[PDB]
Amino acid sequence: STQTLQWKCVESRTDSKCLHYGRFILSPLMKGQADTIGIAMRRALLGEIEGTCITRAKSEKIPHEYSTILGIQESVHEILMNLKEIVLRSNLYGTCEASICVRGPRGVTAQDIILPPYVEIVDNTQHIASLTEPIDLCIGLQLERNRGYHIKAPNNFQDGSFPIDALFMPVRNVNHSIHSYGNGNEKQEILFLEIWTNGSLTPKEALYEASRNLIDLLIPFLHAE
Amino acid sequence: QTYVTSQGPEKVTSEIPHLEAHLLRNLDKNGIVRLGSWVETGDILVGKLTPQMAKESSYAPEDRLLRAILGIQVSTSKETCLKLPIGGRGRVIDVRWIQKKGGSSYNPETIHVYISQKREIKVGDK
């Protein structure tokens, strides 16, 4: 009889290519609903959305992880560490392959990656390698889409296939607040949400996926048995 | 290290009689594991065929029964190798092989193997 539930986006800043922020508001929520919505949405956003990333890097003519290469200022382990931060997008479950074959004194960035048709990078200037002298540099990579943090074994040696324990975190941070509405006798409350993502997704999409994963999870009970 | 016994100066080799080949998968042709191998616990790093006595008389009757009933051959070389202890897993980052140079004509060779390990922070750390 009094008002209807409304939700809207009140702010969205693009601080950088791989960092996006978004604040949202909900309208006349009666008691108890706001806390449940806020806590469920925070948990879902922190641990339900899935984001693809590089999981295994294969290099040519390299003995081990802690080795040096002529003409490269960055050690191999440094290259793995720098390679873990590359952000990617996809929507299909399954592992894929990728490669990077670059010449010598260039300076290698994230735009030098070669990607399958359905995978694209979001930032295009993330430093991944620095080159000084002319040496042909060829590295193969594997891309995977999982949920949450996963740790992999060092198996599948080949010449060298170093597995990077990539973190599947598309949402950097989440916050919420439950204010008061002062609706006379009836106690209403205003709920504010706040999402920081890393550019793999965007607000109003991470929120969508996080709501849908939750409504996935709550569902078995509706069926009888 | 290696020593000069009565029979022989503990010859270094890449193969050991009646030793599991899986335990020698990372062993190089010279006899020392090469770089990059993900050596686990119980894996041989350096294996030297110490010349064992031809002591069939000293061999236990159980050993003789095992070698005769199952056809296991009788060898005169002791099982001498640098087996990795419990834990200590990792990736070989450096190998060193040296010998002796002095008045003695025999050169006991000493081998150093450097096994690194990237250890995270887990329950029980301080």
CA distance, residue A28 to nearest chain B CA (Å): 46
Q: Which amino acid is at A176?
A: H
- A165: nearest CA in chain B? B120
**Which residue, among A44, A23, A4, A18, has the nearest Cα to A193 in the 3D structure?**
A23
Nearest to B38 among A63, A66, A154 (CB): A154
Residues of A in contact with B91 (CB under 8 A): 64-66, 154
**Which residue, among B27, B21, B48, has the nearest Cα to B110 in the 3D structure?**
B48
DSSP labels, A166-213 = -EE--EEEEEEEE-----TTS-EEEEEEEEEE-SSS-TTTHHHHHHHH
Per the entry, the structure determination technique was: cryo-EM
**Residue B116 and residue A160: Cβ atoms within 8 Å?**
no
Buried b / exposed e along A50-62 (16+ C-beta atoms within 10 A) = bbbbbbbbbbeeb
- The 3-state DSSP composition of chain B as helix, strand, coil percent (nearest 5) reads 10, 30, 60
Taking the CB of residue A104, how many other CB atoms lie within 10 A of it? 13
Resolution in A: 3.2
Residues of A in contact with B35 (CB under 8 A): 63-64
Which DSSP helix (H) or strand (E) runs through A127?
A: strand A127-129
